Each structure stands twice: as C-alpha cells, then as structure tokens.
Amino acid sequence: AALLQCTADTLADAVLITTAHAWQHQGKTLFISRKTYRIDGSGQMAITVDVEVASDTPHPARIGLNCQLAQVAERVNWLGLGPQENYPDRLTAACFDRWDLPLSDMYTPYVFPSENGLRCGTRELNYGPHQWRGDFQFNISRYSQQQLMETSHRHLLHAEEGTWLNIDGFHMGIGGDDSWSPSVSAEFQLSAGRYHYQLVWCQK
Amino acid sequence: RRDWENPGVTQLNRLAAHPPFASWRNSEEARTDRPSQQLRSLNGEWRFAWFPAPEAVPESWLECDLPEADTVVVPSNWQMHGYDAPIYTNVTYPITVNPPFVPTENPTGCYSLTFNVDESWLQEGQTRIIFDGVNSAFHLWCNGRWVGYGQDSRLPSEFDLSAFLRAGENRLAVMVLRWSDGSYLEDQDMWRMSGIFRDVSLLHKPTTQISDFHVATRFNDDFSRAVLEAEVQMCGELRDYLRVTVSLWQGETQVASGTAPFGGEIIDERGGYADRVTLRLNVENPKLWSAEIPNLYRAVVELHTADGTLIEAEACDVGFREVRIENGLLLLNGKPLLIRGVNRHEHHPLHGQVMDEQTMVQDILLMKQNNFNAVRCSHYPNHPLWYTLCDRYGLYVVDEANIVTHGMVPMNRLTDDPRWLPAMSERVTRMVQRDRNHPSVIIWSLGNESGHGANHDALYRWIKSVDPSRPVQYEGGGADTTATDIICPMYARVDEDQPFPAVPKWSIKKWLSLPGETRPLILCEYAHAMGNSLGGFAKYWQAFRQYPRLQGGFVWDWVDQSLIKYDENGNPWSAYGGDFGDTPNDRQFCMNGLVFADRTPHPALTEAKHQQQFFQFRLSGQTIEVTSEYLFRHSDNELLHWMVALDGKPLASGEVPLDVAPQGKQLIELPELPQPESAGQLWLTVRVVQPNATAWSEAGHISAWQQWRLAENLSVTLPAASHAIPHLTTSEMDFCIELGNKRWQFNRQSGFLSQMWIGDKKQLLTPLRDQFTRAPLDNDIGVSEATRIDPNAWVERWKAAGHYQAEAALLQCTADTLADAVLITTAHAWQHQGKTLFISRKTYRIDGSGQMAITVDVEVASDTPHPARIGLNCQLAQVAERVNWLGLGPQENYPDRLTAACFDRWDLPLSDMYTPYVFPSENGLRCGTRELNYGPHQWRGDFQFNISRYSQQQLMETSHRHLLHAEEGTWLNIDGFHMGIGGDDSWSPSVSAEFQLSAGRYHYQLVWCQK
C-alpha cells in the first residue's frame, strides 16, 4: 500500500475521512483503493470502498477488508446465506436466514488448509460488541490468511491471538470442474475493473 | 363460372413451366447471353381502369379501350398509383376467412395494351405471352377473344397467342382480381397489393422447339472430376434428322461438347421418351461454384438438324457444385456450410412490390458487404433476375414455394386438406421447373407458416423424387417434422426453451441432441430486427461456431417495409400499417429490417457484419492468431492493419499481409511496442482490409475487425492543490455554490441541481434528475396496444408498477463546507400508490478547481419489474454541433448489442447521435464511455449515454419519426446502467437475464467540469 491521499473533514454532525491507496509491484499499479469513513452522531462508522483493478493483471481472489480483532467471542451471529460455508459458485444449498453458530463451526478443517469458512449475501454480522452491515461475504476464524497459506496440514495450525475477520465486497469463485487447471467460470471472475461496496461498523 | 372462387381452377389454357427462355437463333448470342430478337419486352405504358367488382366491368372493354382509363407504367402495383388502399396485416387474412370464397366487393384492375406484331412472327412458329407476376388472379383476352386464366402471384403465366394475333396492331385485355382462392395461400407478413407487378414479354419459339432442359453436375470423391448431365426435351414433329448439341464454355474456351439424336433410354415396358435426350459431358478439374468464389460455366443447348441447321438455342449459367446432407451436416462441395443469411422480401418504398435491377443489385452489394452469404426467398418465388444475380455475385439461395396459410385456424387446415393439394402442388412444381437450373439455389422450401399437413409430405417427396440435388426444408408444424431435411425453427433462442404445447421452440443447442435426432439446424428465421433490436445476436454466433450441426440462420429481415406518403407541404415521410386508412392493421410490425426502405443501414447492420466475420482472432502476448472461416478460398485480397492507442491517442500502427488457407491459421507477430509514461489503457485494434476492388466491394473495404485491451496504467497522480475555495450561500429554498465564473444552484424543496452557470450564462432548462425509464423500444412493447394490453410485455410491467409516473419524494438535502470544497448530500424515494420503488442517494462534491464529483447509489425493490435504466437526465441550454467521446463507437450501441463497437476517441455531428427509427424510441446510446464532450461541458466516469434534440417523453409520445420536433436545447441522458434491448423475437420478453438490471443496489460516479 502506497498512500496517495488522507484527509479529514468536519460535517454538521459527522467526521469525514477520505483515503486513497495504490498497490504497486515492480513499478506497476495493481489495485487502487479509494475510501471514505463517515462516523456520525449515532456512533456508527459508514465505510465506502471504491476499487480499481488493472485490466492486465490477473483477476483478484477477493476485494475486501481485513483486520485482527482483539476480541475472542463464543458465538457468531449473521443474517445471510448459511448455515454452512458457501462461496459465489457454490451457494445454492445455503439459505438466507438468521444463523447463530459457535466460532469453530465458522472454520472448515480442510486437511490441507486454505481459504475457508466464507458465507455470502450477508447483510448483518455480529461478533462480541461489533456489528457490520451491508451486502458482503465474510469469514471469521482464529487463523490468518497468512498462517493458512504457510501451513500444509490442519493439525499444524495454532489459534492466533484474537480473531481474524475477512469482509469482502466481492470474492472469486472456487471452481472444481477439475483440480489441475483453472476451472473458475468467467462469470465468477473478478474482472469488472471497478468495484464498489459499502460497510457500516457499529456497536450493539 | 367464378373461377377465382374455385381451388379446382388454378389456370385455364396456361402453358407448361420451364427454365428461362430466349429462343436464340444464333448460338454465339446464346453463349454470350446477349439480348434475343425472339424475346420482346411489353413493359411500358398501358391503359388502366379500376372497378369495385368483376361484375362492374363494362362488356365493351373487351373490344374497345375505355375513355375513363388512365395511362400507367407496367409493371406496377395499382395501390402505388392510389387506386385503392394497400393493406398491412401480419397473421389475420385481409378478407373474411370463408374458403374458397372472397368478398363480392373485389377490387378489379383492368389493364390493356395496343401493341405491334411483326408479320415474321405470325408467318411461322409460335408466339406466346409471358406474365411474370400478376397479383393475385387474372383473365386474359386478346383482340376481344378469351385466351385463359391463371393464379399464383409469384410465378410466370404463359399463353399461346399465335391463333389470336394478326399483323401489326393487336390489343390485350387483362382483368386482374385483387382477391381469389389463391389469396388463401398468400398470407405472408407483408403489404397486400395487386396488379401486374412483374415483367410482361412476348416470346417467339419455333414449332419444333426446346420445351424443357435440366442441368445436373455430379462429382468424384475429391471433386477433381465431374460429369455434367443435361436432359433436353422437345415439342413438335419427331424426325430422324433432329439432334441436340450441349456445349460447355468457360469464357471463350469450350471445355466440353456432346451431340446425340433424340430418343432417351428405355424407361419401362412401353419403351422410353422418343421426344427426349440426355447429354453427358466429362469435365476434368472443374472450377467449383460457391458464394465465396462464384465460378460459372456457360452451357449452350442447340436444337438442330444433324446436317447443321440450328433450329433454336437456349442457354444458362452453370455452377459446378454439390449440395448434400451427410452425417447430420449440410455440405457444399464436401465442406460444412455456415449460413450467414437474411430473409428478403421484394419491397420498394416507392414502387411497392415491383422489383428492378438497380434495387436488386444494391441489395446484393450491401448484403455481401456486410458478410452475408445467403438469402431466403421469403415467402415466394422471386423475380427471375434475382437468381441470375445470386449466381454471378455469389449467394446461397433458399427458394420457397408461394404457400402461406398463417391465418387459418388451425394453421394446417388447408394443407392437411387433400382438396387443396392440386393448388399447392403447382406452387411447388412450377417453382422447381422454373429455377432448378440455377446454381445459387441450394435448398428448396415448401412455403412458410402453414402448419404441417399431409400435402406437405406428398410435396416434400415429390421434390426428393424429381430433384435429388437439393435438400427440402419446411418450418411449419414444429420445424422438425417429416416434411423437412433441416431443423429450421423461427425465433428459437440459443439457451432458453420456449416449450409451447405441440410446437415447442427448443433451445437450438438442446434441439440437435434430442433422442433420435440427427439432422442439421439452420433457423429459417431468427434475430427479429424490429426497431432498436439485434440484442443477443452474438449469443447465436458463438453457438453456431461451437456446434458443428448448428449451421447458421436467416435474419428477419432485410428491408423495412415502409411506404412513402406525402404531407400538406408535399414532403415525403415513411409510413406503415394503418397510414393508408387500412384496417385492421398490425401497425409498425411491417418494419423489421436491418436497412430502412431506402436501403440506409440501421445500426444493427454493423452488428451483423461483425458477427458474420470470415476471420476469427485470438491474442496471446504479442502474437495475433488469424483463423479463416472460408471453406474454399485463400485470403488472396486481404491484409491486416493493426493499431495500438492509449485512450484515443495513436501510439503505433502497421500492415501485415494476410496469407491464410481456407480453414487455416496465420500467426502474425507484432513488433515490440514501446509503452508510454502517461496513465491510461492501451487498446489494440485490428482490421482486415481488401486492397483490391471486387464485383461486390470497392478498394479499401473493411471485411473484419477486432479489439483487445493491452497494458493499463492506472493513474496514481492527484490534481494540484486548488487555487481557491468555493463559497456556499444558504436560503430556505436553495443551496448556492460560487467559484470563479462557475455557479451551482441546488433546490432544497426538490433536492436537485436546478441551474448551473459558466461565466454568466445559464446551462440548464430542466433540472438534473434521476431517470429509471426509457421511451419503450419495439421489443419493450411487443404486441401490447391500448385496446388489447399484453401484461407480460416489459412496457406494461413498467406502466403497471408505476415507473413512468412515480414522483420523487425528498428525504434528505444538506450542505457542508469542507476545507477545500462544498458537499451537497441528497436522498430521494420514488413511490407509486404507497409503494417505494427506488431510493437514490447522492453526494455532489465541488472543490476549488471547478469540478463537480457526483456519486450516485441507487436501491431498487426486488418485487418491482427491473427498471429500463438507472441514470440521470437534464435539458442543457446549449446546442452544439459536435459530440466528442472516449468510448464505444462510432455507431449506436447497447449492452446486449455492442460487440461491433470499438473503444476510441469518436467525433460526430449531433444529428448522427440520433437514430431515426420510423417508430421513435430510446435510441442512439453509446456504451462504455469514459469521457463525454459537448460544447463547454465534459463528463468523466464509466457510463452509457444518449444526446439529442428529443426528450424521452416526446419519443414515447410520438408514433412516427417525421412528427418529431426538435426541442429547445439538448436532452442529455447519462446512465450508470442500461437494460438490454432484446430481439430474439418482438412479441414476448426477450431481454436475456444477464442484461437485466436486477442487482438490487447500483453505484455510479460522474465528474462534471468545464473542459
């Protein structure tokens, strides 16, 4: 991330933070992320994300935000597709409803660890005191994306301090027509070039 | 007798059908196809009189010319001279359905002609009259004496006149009836006209004559050897001294000749045909015929005495080619065809249904210029000259019998009736007898929309038995019956089933592989080009190519069937169904063409051209793979221009010669392109150019193109620190922003930007507002009308959901002064009868540079029919001359119809940004636009737009294009998202799901600034 812009403004009843980021590798700009943060009198933080993706870059696996929470809560409650893990090209079984599960169920113990535990079409997510609102896809676990890609076996995974949250506006399909070549169908590739999603973070 | 109300009398004293005759008496004139002294044209000025009924015709008209009569041009349709009204009806018969009866009020056209006959014609041989086209039935008198009667409006009627004509002055009397039992088989979707609309001629033949001749070509496995087989038939006295010589010419070189006496082989127990002969000529390594290369030979047929007295000579152009269906594929010369076709009606805006050479040539030039290789004779035998032209220029023809009974209930009521078999058979047999020698004709058709009846089966078999060379197709009764060799549905979609009871229209991909099915699929009708249509066209051509047994289709259709009418000032305008007082009528449904009546292209024509390309392309790094879809020819008049440009600005370009074998490939290696510093998207564009002129195209013609995105540099550099800070002024009614000479005004009661100032001048006549609706296209309306509403159609769904009259309730309107800008934030709800349809949340940011950054975020209810568009509109006060944009162009394009469009810096005059569809609708959109310049204004973002002097309201409120008045200023429509146009058909929802605005939540952002 290379910072392009970071401003603060004062609205009648809110503070407005505008940010711009570029992702560069070998002088090539891969992704541009433009954000606004609107914390209003209700204590709610409206985050608006606008992302550009270089057309001559391979289409990204995801477009979202991530952070490691200090919190470790016992339950995960959400309004969206579930109750089980679901992905863009594998979400027909899942039903839109209110789901509540213990945190461990939000992780899928694939012997060879990878990205897992995602749920799509989620409008509201609850974890400890936190609430996230919008139209997003999420996973939530004690394992980082970094630990998962570096660990070869599920039993070699250690629970990290706090909780890792991945909230995506857009997640690439998983595929599987076979497992030895690219099999994610075109309509499930993140190729639109310009992506927008908006989140609300608040407390309850 | 009332022969015009009897399906048992289809003619009286009519001569037999045959291929085109000229009765040459010099063999070199036959060979060269030069004019014949024995074939005279009777085209010209005739005397005409109109009557309400045959009963009304005065007995004296047979013996003497009428004083009331007027002098008219023939051929013609008497409707075009204004004698009665041309009727447009789609399905329903223009008369009361009571076979075989027609109204007692039957518009009767009385044509006559006083003409001269040379003594020489009457001293010897036979003198006949040929009426190429008379609509729909007629009696003929000559010098007062009755000659005969004839039906079938689309094939020549011929009568022997020797015993009737005297030296010098003679008089014809042709009483033509508008309606007859023939009309029951003539229910095509077209204008209902009448009269002598094709050529009239006089042919002198010797007594001992050529009465028929069939030409056939058969081939060895690899087509390097052929046997030309010509069967010749005679009339008159059979004598031992008679011979036939069939010679075969290639330009001036005679490649084969055969001479035999009369008397064919033994056929059965009673012998053979002593009045016939079959000549068989061997032809080594023959030049083959195709629409790709229309190689032709000339076959001269000489009837002569053995001792060398030529009695007469007939002739034709021969195309050595073979059509067969093998293993489920249609093959021309051993190669599977890909039918890039169109349905063509014989139509002229001024002349109606009279065809002329100039027009016919113009059509063929244009068709071939737009990558068409085939044409369907919808729905009748055509003018004789058409087949000759297709032979020479190169087009695969589907020749179709004049049998259409669409308005019967059920559709096969006549065609299942054995009492209607005689009348039907003549429409099939006399077609075959006339056109079977033409190489361009590759497929026979039994008619159109007459269901499936046992008469279709009998006739199918008849053609299979008579002519083994050509497949017989027919669509009626399910498009896959026992009456057709090819699955030929009309308006079957690519992936979507339309499973009607008894006659389902299956997905063309699904259809091919139904249990037990093997035959090839070529749609006789597809892609209904009505008004703003042809959306989803690429879907067809992706499928055609992927699937071997999907061998193409025939677009519906070629030309808009609009007719010229004149106003109080004498100004011409394009008219349709109902405009001639004609009723019942199916309004604008007569206009479904890729070209207007005057042959001006619709924007869809370019979409057809791009898809029907004969060269396919792929990209991999710096290598362009060019793939030829030609079956027989090399790329011998082709090179490849290539262009790399950074957002409109040319970077590098070159030419590489195309050298691709048929079905072959060429790898063209691009030179290492130096990449630029400044940000933007690099765009490669390739064009196939023909350096040399052809019979059909001029030098520099572009036959193909393609585009790719190359490298992209996303802009990471921000604008400079602003030289000022814009001021806000607050009122109860208004928020007002001021900076330099620029001024913005937002109305606080409405919540919209209501005025803008550059310098001191106004910029708006109508406030900048959200718009979720469009002036409905023909595909939006379907068959719906005021009297008969079709609730399933898009326009009615929008109407009923309240989209067109929903009013904006303001929810939020605030102003905040930032450190370098002013921020206007708004929210609106669109409601109808207590239902919220749309919410539009906006932010307008105006900083110290003078730029306005608009951010729109729209919510659409899930249970409301998907909106036509999601965008903004306003009426600018400015009227500029030019429109300049960076986006898809140059022509009109829409989401489901934009493949032909290329991304570049385009610059057009304002008038070109409006498509004058005879029935006005949403038009002239350009998609994927990143920057738009109009006068002092610039809009930047990722949007779709149209810009014209006509409002969406005016467009949807006006029925004809000529009634459109330019409004004050310029109506600008900028959408973030636009619905597909559809067009798989024009009578039911046809916009594909992926092009429907159904995401629920939409986002778009525009920057409005002065350039």
Ligand SMILES: [Mg+2]
């Ligand atoms: Mg489901």
Ligand SMILES: [Mg+2]
């Ligand atoms: Mg009759």
Ligand SMILES: [Mg+2]
């Ligand atoms: Mg000779």
Ligand SMILES: [Mg+2]
């Ligand atoms: Mg009507």
Ligand SMILES: [Mg+2]
């Ligand atoms: Mg392409």
Ligand code: NA
């Ligand atoms: Na791993």
Ligand code: NA
């Ligand atoms: Na094919």
Ligand code: NA
């Ligand atoms: Na039509």
Ligand code: NA
């Ligand atoms: Na209209």
